[PDB]
Structure 1
C-alpha cells in the first residue's frame, strides 16, 4: 500500500543468505561471478588515463553515450554482426548489462505481455518481466541422454518452444553464452529461435555479455546477424565481462531505430547520463582490441585460452570428489550434477519446499569450505523441484584460488 504494486513478489534476493553464510566461514569462494585477479594492464591504464586527461571528462557527457564509445561500438560490433550501425540511432550506453536489460524490459514489456524465458536463466529476467507487468513464460533446456556432461547437449525442443508462443508474446530473452549453464547456442538453434520470432512478430532480447568467453573452438554467433533479425533484435553487452572489470558497470544495447527510440525514452527518464570517464576507458580498451583483433597478443585471444585451462583444471578437480561437471562451451561458469550426493545424503537440514541444492550448498560451505551457487535459483519456482541437483561454480579465478580449492578438495577426499 505505501509501495507501488509493480514491486509485488520481486523483493526477495536468494543471494543474501549464502553470501552471509560464506562470510562467517573459512572458504574458497567459487560462487562469485567475477575475476579475483586484475583486469588487463591496457584496461586499467585506460581508466587511469580517463581520470588524468582532459579535465572536462569530469563533467556530463552525451545522454545516449560518450561519442568516442558509441563510435567504436558501432564500428567494431558493426563488423562482428555484418551490420551497418549508426552510433546515435542504434547504440545506447547503459549502467552495465543489468541496466541494459532493465531499459529493454521497461521500454517494451507492458501489462499482459508474455516474455519467453529459457531455463536455466540469469535470475533477473523473471522479476524484470514482473515489474514491467509482463507474464513470464518458461521453457527448459533439457540434457540429452561417458560420465561427464556437455552444455552443448542441453537441448531446446523445437516443439516445446513453438508451443510457448502466443498472440501475447512480446519478447523472448536469449542468453548466449548462457549463465549458469555455459551453453553456446549453435547456428541451427538460433535459426529455430529466429524463425519463430519472425513468424510470431516477437522481439529477441539477446544477452551476449559472455560473447568473448568461448572455448574448445566454439564460435559465438549473434542472432541479430541472421537474415531479417536486426529489425527485431536488441543485443546487449557488458564492458565488465568483456574486460574482466565488473565494477566498471558499463554496458550497451545495439538495435534498430524503431525499437531503440523507446529504450532512449526510458534512459532519458531514469538515469539520463552514464558516467563519463568509465565510458572513455571502455572506448580506449575497445580501440586496443580492435587494433589487435585476431592477433595472438589480443586479450580476446589470450584470455579465453587462459580461462579454458582454469575450466579444465576445475573440471578435473571437482570430478575427483564425486561431483559430475557439465563441460561449458562458454561463460565464467560450470555446473556440476550433485545427484550422487542426493542419493547418499538425501536428508539434509532445511526449510520446507527448500530445494536440495540450496541445502547442499549450505552443507558444503559449513563442512567443506567451498562456495558454489544452487542452480535452482535460475529456475521458475514450479521447476525447482525437478531441477534441484545442480550447483554452479566460477572458474575465472587466480591460480592461487584454484590451488586453495584443490586443498579443500583433497581434505574432503579423506572420507
Structure 2
C-alpha cells in the first residue's frame, strides 16, 4: 500500500484511454478521437515505405537524440521563413514523440515545485496533469461565449482580460496558449496575442504556444505565431506536430522550437525520457517537408489545401448539428466542433441522481445507443469549472463525406422528420 507523491494523483485513466476503449467496445461511428478517416498525402506514406526499404543500413538504426539531422534541417528551413529569423537547426529545435512529448519536455524542463502555470480553459487535457507532475501550481481562466442565441463563432469565446492579469504574479512561471484551439477552434487574433504577450513581458513569464493546428485556419482568419511579437522570441517555446501537419497521427512525431537558452532544458528532459525518436519516421517527415518547401504557395501544398478541404466539412457539420437542435460553435480553425446540446437544457425532463457531469453520460449514452461517438468537453476543464462544459459536446469532422452524411442521418433519425 504505497504512495507516489510525485504528483501522480487521480487521472486513473485519461479521457482517451477511457473513450478509446469504449470505441473499441461498442464500435460506433467514431467522431471523437481526432484523426482522418481516410488516407493521408501519398508522398508522405511513400516516403516511409522508402525509409523502411532504404539501402542505407543507418536508415533504421539510432539517429541523433535531439532529432534526425534531415528533419531538423527541414524544420529550420520552414519555420525560419514563418518566423522571419534564422533558427538554428541544432540548438533551437527539438524533435519529440509527438506534440505530447514536446509539451512534456517543456513543462518538466521549466516548471519547478511551487511554480505557477496559467492554463486557459477549455484546455487540451494533458496540460494540467503535466504541470502537476512537475510540482507546478495550475491557475485556470475559462474562455466564455458572447451571449449564445444559436450558432456562434469560436471568436465569440473570449476570456476576461481583467481576470487574466489578476492571475499574473511573481510566482507565475509559465502560461500555455493553444492556437488554433482545441476543442473550440478559436484563432487568437493580434489583440488577444498582444494581451498575453504584454503580461509575459511585464512578469517575465515563459509562453508555451501549442500550435499543432497551425495550418488549419479557415478564411478569412489567419494563424499568427506569438513568438513573432516584439520581445517574445526570447521567452517563447512553440510546438508543432507531424501527425497534425501531415494528417498521420499514428507517426507520433512533434517538435519544439525557440531560443537555445530555453530549449536546453527541453533537451535534458528528452534525453533522459526517451533519448531518441524513430529514425525512418523522421526521415519520411523530412522528405514531406522538403516536398512542401518547394511549393509553399501552391494550392496543391498540403499546408494550404487542408483548410479548404476541411471548410466544406466544417460547414456541413455545423448545419446538421443546428438542424437537429444543437447550438454549434463554428471554429475558425481545426477539425473540431463544440456544440451546445439540447434535451434538458430548457426542457427539464430526465434526471441524473448519479450526479456526474451530463456531457459524459450523454456522450457515452450516444455511442452505446445510437452509435455516434462525441467527446465530453468537461474533460478539458479544471475540477471546479467542469460545469462550464457539461451542456456541450465535441465532434471531429475530419471524416470522409459518406461518414459525415452518416452522422447527419443518425442524428435526423434519433430525432424525427415530419
Give the TM-score taking structure 1 as reference length: 0.96
Cα distance per residue 1:51-74 (max 9 Å; x no partner): 112221111111111111111111
- Alignment partner, residue 390 of structure 1: 392
> Cα RMSD over matched residues?
1.6
CA contact (8 A) 1:10 1:131 kept: no
Cα distance per residue 1:318-374 (max 9 Å; x no partner): 11111111000011201001245433255354633x111112112322333211111
Give the count of matched residue pairs.
414
- Alignment partner, residue 37 of structure 1: 38
Cα distance per residue 1:127-178 (max 9 Å; x no partner): 0000000011001111112621110111122111000111111100000001
- Alignment partner, residue 81 of structure 2: 79
Give the deviation of 1:11 after TM superposition: 3.3
Alignment partner for residue 143 of structure 1, among 137, 141, 145? 145
- Alignment partner, residue 368 of structure 1: 370
Alignment partner for residue 298 of structure 2, among 288, 295, 303? 295
Cα distance per residue 1:99-143 (max 9 Å; x no partner): 000000110111101000000100000000000000110011111
Residues of 2 paired with 1:264 and 1:24: CA distance?
39
Residues of 2 paired with 1:62 and 1:350: CA distance?
55
Alignment partner for residue 238 of structure 1, among 241, 255, 270? 241
- Alignment partner, residue 321 of structure 2: 318
Residues of 2 paired with 1:25 and 1:12: CA distance?
18
CA contact (8 A) 2:20 2:33 kept: no
CA contact (8 A) 1:114 1:168 kept: yes
Residues of 2 paired with 1:17 and 1:265: CA distance?
31
Question: 1:92-107 to 2 correspondence within 5 Å?
Answer: 92-107=94-109
CA contact (8 A) 1:151 1:328 kept: yes
Residue 173 of structure 2 aligns to a residue in which SS? strand
Residue 91 of structure 2 aligns to a residue in which SS? helix
Matched, 1:5 2:5: yes
Residues of 1 paired with 2:115 and 2:368: CA distance?
43
- Alignment partner, residue 158 of structure 2: 155
Residues of 1 paired with 2:327 and 2:118: CA distance?
29
Residues of 2 paired with 1:255 and 1:171: CA distance?
15
Question: 1:264-413 to 2 correspondence within 5 Å?
Answer: 264-339=267-342, 341-344=344-347, 346-349=349-352, 351-352=354-355, 354-413=356-415
Give the deviation of 1:17 after TM superposition: 4.3
Greater shift, 258-267 or 231-240, is seen at: 258-267
Residues of 2 paired with 1:18 and 1:218: CA distance?
32
Matched, 1:255 2:258: yes
Residues of 2 paired with 1:200 and 1:268: CA distance?
30
Residue 345 of structure 2 aligns to a residue in which SS? helix
Question: 1:134-213 to 2 correspondence within 5 Å?
Answer: 134-145=136-147, 147-213=150-216
Residues of 2 paired with 1:350 and 1:369: CA distance?
25
Residues of 2 paired with 1:334 and 1:12: CA distance?
24
- Alignment partner, residue 58 of structure 1: 60
Pair 3,286 (structure 1): closer, same or farther in 2 beyond 3 Å: farther
Residues of 1 paired with 2:283 and 2:263: CA distance?
22
Residues of 2 paired with 1:383 and 1:267: CA distance?
32
CA contact (8 A) 1:349 1:359 kept: no
Cα distance per residue 1:287-332 (max 9 Å; x no partner): 1111111211111222210111111111111111111110000112
Greater shift, 7-16 or 354-363, is seen at: 7-16
- Alignment partner, residue 116 of structure 2: 114
Give the deviation of 1:275 after TM superposition: 1.1
Unaligned runs of 5+ in 2: none
Give the TM-score taking structure 2 as reference length: 0.95
CA contact (8 A) 1:156 1:189 kept: no
Give the deviation of 1:14 after TM superposition: 3.2
Cα distance per residue 1:188-233 (max 9 Å; x no partner): 1001110000000000011000001111221111100111101000
Residues of 2 paired with 1:203 and 1:309: CA distance?
37
Give the deviation of 1:16 after TM superposition: 4.2
Alignment partner for residue 69 of structure 1, among 52, 57, 71? 71
Unaligned runs of 5+ in 1: none
Pair 296,208 (structure 1): closer, same or farther in 2 beyond 3 Å: same
